[PDB]
Amino acid sequence: GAMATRQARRNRRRRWRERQRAAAAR
């Protein structure tokens, strides 16, 4: 969809956010 891309831009940014938790937090 057209909006799917809009919210998606935040998904990719969030996916990396929680991913850092592994390094930042033991």
Report phi then psi at 25, rounded to 5. Answer: -115, 135
Look up the domain containing 20 and give its range: 1-26
What is the tally of structural domains in the chain? 1
Rg, the chain, Cα only: 12
Three-state secondary structure string covering 1-26: CHHHHHHHHHHHHHHHHHHHHHHHCC
Cα–Cα distance, 26 to 9 (Å, whole number): 28
Neighbours of 1 (CB within 10 A): 7
Cα–Cα distance, 5 to 24 (Å, whole number): 29
What was the structure determination method? NMR
